[PDB]
Design an enzyme around this catalytic site. Structure first.
Site, PDB file in Angstrom:
ATOM      1  N   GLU A 182      39.081  -1.844  21.422  1.00 42.31           N
ATOM      2  CA  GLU A 182      39.222  -2.708  20.273  1.00 42.31           C
ATOM      3  C   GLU A 182      37.986  -3.549  20.109  1.00 42.31           C
ATOM      4  OE1 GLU A 182      42.236  -3.546  17.310  1.00 42.31           O
ATOM      5  OE2 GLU A 182      40.538  -4.732  17.986  1.00 42.31           O
ATOM      6  N   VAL A 203      34.634  -5.422  19.427  1.00 41.24           N
ATOM      7  CA  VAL A 203      33.273  -4.972  19.367  1.00 41.24           C
ATOM      8  C   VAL A 203      33.096  -3.589  19.972  1.00 41.24           C
ATOM      9  CG1 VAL A 203      30.915  -5.496  20.119  1.00 41.24           C
ATOM     10  CG2 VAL A 203      32.425  -7.299  19.227  1.00 41.24           C
ATOM     11  N   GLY A 204      33.852  -3.279  21.025  1.00 40.90           N
ATOM     12  CA  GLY A 204      33.789  -1.930  21.602  1.00 40.90           C
ATOM     13  C   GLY A 204      34.191  -0.852  20.637  1.00 40.90           C
ATOM     14  N   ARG A 248      41.125   0.459  29.453  1.00 38.29           N
ATOM     15  CA  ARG A 248      42.377   0.516  30.254  1.00 38.29           C
ATOM     16  C   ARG A 248      43.540   1.151  29.509  1.00 38.29           C
ATOM     17  NH1 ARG A 248      42.354  -5.722  31.355  1.00 38.29           N
ATOM     18  NH2 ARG A 248      41.903  -5.415  29.135  1.00 38.29           N
ATOM     19  N   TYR A 291      33.118 -17.328  32.649  1.00 40.25           N
ATOM     20  CA  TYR A 291      32.832 -16.736  31.333  1.00 40.25           C
ATOM     21  C   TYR A 291      31.351 -16.890  31.004  1.00 40.25           C
ATOM     22  CZ  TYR A 291      33.633 -15.712  26.310  1.00 40.25           C
ATOM     23  OH  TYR A 291      33.608 -15.124  25.076  1.00 40.25           O
TER      24      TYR A 291
HETATM   25  N1  LIG Z   1      41.329  -7.496  19.596  1.00 40.40           N
HETATM   26  C1  LIG Z   1      42.572  -7.882  20.002  1.00 40.40           C
HETATM   27  O1  LIG Z   1      43.580  -7.414  19.473  1.00 40.40           O
HETATM   28  C2  LIG Z   1      42.750  -8.849  21.126  1.00 40.40           C
HETATM   29  C3  LIG Z   1      43.946  -8.865  21.834  1.00 40.40           C
HETATM   30  C4  LIG Z   1      44.072  -9.768  22.882  1.00 40.40           C
HETATM   31  C5  LIG Z   1      43.047 -10.619  23.172  1.00 40.40           C
HETATM   32  N2  LIG Z   1      41.900 -10.605  22.465  1.00 40.40           N
HETATM   33  C6  LIG Z   1      40.850 -11.574  22.771  1.00 40.40           C
HETATM   34  O2  LIG Z   1      39.604 -11.308  22.140  1.00 40.40           O
HETATM   35  C7  LIG Z   1      38.663 -11.058  23.209  1.00 40.40           C
HETATM   36  C8  LIG Z   1      38.715  -9.616  23.686  1.00 40.40           C
HETATM   37  O3  LIG Z   1      38.409  -8.961  22.511  1.00 40.40           O
HETATM   38  P1  LIG Z   1      38.733  -7.457  22.235  1.00 40.40           P
HETATM   39  O4  LIG Z   1      39.760  -6.812  23.065  1.00 40.40           O
HETATM   40  O5  LIG Z   1      38.946  -7.516  20.751  1.00 40.40           O
HETATM   41  O6  LIG Z   1      37.406  -6.564  22.263  1.00 40.40           O
HETATM   42  P2  LIG Z   1      36.046  -6.694  23.066  1.00 40.40           P
HETATM   43  O7  LIG Z   1      35.834  -8.007  23.736  1.00 40.40           O
HETATM   44  O8  LIG Z   1      35.086  -6.062  22.117  1.00 40.40           O
HETATM   45  O9  LIG Z   1      36.341  -5.756  24.396  1.00 40.40           O
HETATM   46  C9  LIG Z   1      36.358  -4.372  24.151  1.00 40.40           C
HETATM   47  C10 LIG Z   1      37.426  -3.734  25.011  1.00 40.40           C
HETATM   48  O10 LIG Z   1      37.007  -3.756  26.343  1.00 40.40           O
HETATM   49  C11 LIG Z   1      38.121  -3.372  27.114  1.00 40.40           C
HETATM   50  N3  LIG Z   1      38.153  -3.974  28.444  1.00 40.40           N
HETATM   51  C12 LIG Z   1      38.365  -5.289  28.724  1.00 40.40           C
HETATM   52  N4  LIG Z   1      38.516  -5.478  30.048  1.00 40.40           N
HETATM   53  C13 LIG Z   1      38.312  -4.247  30.623  1.00 40.40           C
HETATM   54  C14 LIG Z   1      38.371  -3.750  32.000  1.00 40.40           C
HETATM   55  N5  LIG Z   1      38.595  -4.637  32.996  1.00 40.40           N
HETATM   56  N6  LIG Z   1      38.140  -2.413  32.184  1.00 40.40           N
HETATM   57  C15 LIG Z   1      37.919  -1.597  31.131  1.00 40.40           C
HETATM   58  N7  LIG Z   1      37.908  -1.970  29.839  1.00 40.40           N
HETATM   59  C16 LIG Z   1      38.114  -3.273  29.574  1.00 40.40           C
HETATM   60  C17 LIG Z   1      39.384  -3.847  26.323  1.00 40.40           C
HETATM   61  O11 LIG Z   1      40.279  -2.742  26.037  1.00 40.40           O
HETATM   62  P3  LIG Z   1      41.455  -2.341  27.141  1.00 40.40           P
HETATM   63  O12 LIG Z   1      42.369  -3.588  27.157  1.00 40.40           O
HETATM   64  O13 LIG Z   1      42.108  -1.139  26.534  1.00 40.40           O
HETATM   65  O14 LIG Z   1      40.764  -2.188  28.451  1.00 40.40           O
HETATM   66  C18 LIG Z   1      38.826  -4.398  25.038  1.00 40.40           C
HETATM   67  O15 LIG Z   1      39.572  -4.032  23.854  1.00 40.40           O
HETATM   68  C19 LIG Z   1      39.101 -11.808  24.410  1.00 40.40           C
HETATM   69  O16 LIG Z   1      38.613 -13.155  24.292  1.00 40.40           O
HETATM   70  C20 LIG Z   1      40.588 -11.740  24.272  1.00 40.40           C
HETATM   71  O17 LIG Z   1      41.016 -13.009  24.750  1.00 40.40           O
HETATM   72  C21 LIG Z   1      41.762  -9.767  21.453  1.00 40.40           C
END
Ligand SMILES: NC(=O)c1ccc[n+]([C@@H]2O[C@H](COP(=O)([O-])OP(=O)(O)OC[C@H]3O[C@@H](n4cnc5c(N)ncnc54)[C@H](OP(=O)(O)O)[C@@H]3O)[C@@H](O)[C@H]2O)c1
Ligand SMILES: NC(=O)c1ccc[n+]([C@@H]2O[C@H](COP(=O)([O-])OP(=O)(O)OC[C@H]3O[C@@H](n4cnc5c(N)ncnc54)[C@H](OP(=O)(O)O)[C@@H]3O)[C@@H](O)[C@H]2O)c1
Lengths: 263, 262
Positions: free
Chosen positions: B18, B20-21, B40, B156
């Site tokens: 989700e 940026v990824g 994950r 962070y």
């Molecule tokens: N976009 C949303 O819907 C969402 C939901 C909850 C929280 N957030 C918040 O927004 C930020 C995260 O943003 P993001 O998820 O939108 O996208 P992001 O920061 O662009 O991260 C991209 C992806 O990296 C993956 N990732 C994170 N930890 C990982 C690990 N330990 N191993 C492998 N992959 C990993 C996650 O997908 P996987 O989980 O599939 O690994 C995440 O969707 C955080 O501050 C979080 O608190 C966003």
């Protein structure tokens, strides 16, 4: 997509003029229902009503009411008395930017009326009707802020939470009966309200591409009517809520929702 | 000339599901690259992979891994064996609110693994690949907290600063080679829940002039790839960071970041 024989002759769209409310009017008319369309812009509702009659060949009734005001529900009750009612949706919302103390009480009162009081008066009245004839349907609209909270707009998430949990309760109450109830929780959706936030160029176009259309929200809601009680429109919004719920503390979600206004 | 042609067959998005990824996955696919998508949530990655293949007509590969765990990087290395690699992006981040003493070591260790160890293992491995073939690109993602620090959530900023300064160093190393490296520093990013808390405005418009969608972040990163080494996404974020850097002390910035907690 069929509604008339199963539920009733007339469906009631509470906040009907544009956006999600308009999509509901078109959808129930496509399902065979005549439409009671309620909103503040009476002329605009009349124009919509004429388009619905032309496109779908159902009847329409326009009702001018402002849900932020006391007695709005009672006006609608009078306008529908005598009709065979089969469907209700509470679509309208009101919110107002500001910290709790920075929003005047009269504005707080207006939000209580739109999101809570008018809501519940309608939901109770038409549920009495539906439950008594053992047939009917309700799909109320909530917001992701009802799940996340809405810092700097607090009463918005609060009132949408009230809608969410009241409709979830009633949905479970109706299982096994001829009345089918659902709440559908929207995220960003292409309505005039949304579009008002968007600057013209690619700063706005990027959002257009990740928002849902009102049509798809409504289609999902009817697909799931009678099978799922509490639905979050669109896979991406569903997954997002699940991720926050499963993998983050409540405070992480709350602080994240304040991102625009603090650090 | 498209990305595939410039850099190679496959790009690897480390943290893909989700945000940026996801936007990096879509962007490289728009440039003709096949996508190895790592995260994950395996079934969610499958769905995304399907959408990308349908929209862009490239090939996709899903790799389930958890970068907080030792051995995650090795799982990814095995999965890309034999592929012609042209791009990598490290995107995943873990943080966990709390004063240093109030966060247990097990959570601190998880953060080290995501932000530092798994990050460096992957950066090292794929740079050895890219540098040997003299062809490839890397765009790593940092956060504003890597500049400001993050009182009450120290790892962070700390982890994001490690990513930032490592990537800046390597970006300088790679100028004059066929490998193009960039770090992009992000501010508020419009994800699905945050978007639904827009005020309507034009307080809404005002927020949108500062906050970026993932797509906008990635577009700027690719526009600057092989041209700029370290980028702050968004014009208003650039103005803000300059104001902090030029007109305030380090302590004034830190104390601003800490002024929310007590
Ligand atoms: N976009 C949303 O819907 C969402 C939901 C909850 C929280 N957030 C918040 O927004 C930020 C995260 O943003 P993001 O998820 O939108 O996208 P992001 O920061 O662009 O991260 C991209 C992806 O990296 C993956 N990732 C994170 N930890 C990982 C690990 N330990 N191993 C492998 N992959 C990993 C996650 O997908 P996987 O989980 O599939 O690994 C995440 O969707 C955080 O501050 C979080 O608190 C966003
Ligand atoms: N658009 C989004 O991104 C978004 C995001 C999350 C949740 N939602 C949910 O979707 C629903 C629709 O909200 P929306 O802001 O997008 O507007 P919308 O679909 O345009 O709302 C439908 C109509 O309801 C009417 N309405 C509003 N206030 C009313 C009042 N006091 N009395 C009578 N009618 C009223 C308005 O027309 P009149 O001006 O003619 O009365 C409006 O066009 C809400 O329940 C909201 O919480 C939307």
């Amino acid at each position: 997509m069929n509604l008339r024989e199963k539920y009733g002759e007339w469906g009631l769209i509470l906040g009907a003029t544009e956006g999600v409310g308009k999509a509901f009017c078109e959808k129930i008319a496509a399902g065979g229902m005549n439409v009671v369309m309620v909103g503040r812009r009476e002329e605009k509702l009349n124009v919509l009503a004429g388009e619905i009659r032309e496109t779908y060949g159902v009847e329409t009734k326009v009702v001018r009411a402002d849900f932020s005001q006391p007695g709005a529900a009672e006006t609608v009750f009078a306008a529908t008395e005598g009709l065979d009612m089969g469907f209700m949706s509470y679509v309208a919302c009101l919110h107002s930017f500001g910290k709790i103390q920075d929003t005047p009480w009269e504005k707080h009162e207006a939000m209580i009326n739109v999101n809570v009081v008018t809501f519940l008066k309608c939901f109770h009245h038409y549920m009495r009707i539906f439950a008594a004839q053992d047939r009917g349907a309700v799909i109320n609209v909530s917001s992701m802020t009802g799940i996340s909270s809405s810092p700097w707009n607090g009463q918005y998430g609060a009132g949408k939470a009230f809608i969410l949990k009241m409709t979830e309760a009633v949905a479970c109450e109706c299982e096994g009966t001829g009345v089918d109830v659902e709440v559908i929780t929207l995220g960003t959706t292409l309505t005039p309200s949304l579009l008002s936030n968007l600057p013209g160029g690619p700063q706005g176009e990027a959002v257009m591409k990740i928002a849902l259309t009102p049509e798809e929200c409504v289609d999902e809601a009817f697909e799931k009517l009678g099978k799922e009680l509490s639905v979050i429109a669109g896979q991406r919004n569903k997954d997002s809520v699940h991720d926050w719920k499963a993998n983050h503390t409540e405070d992480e979600y709350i602080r994240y929702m304040g991102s625009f206004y603090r650090d």
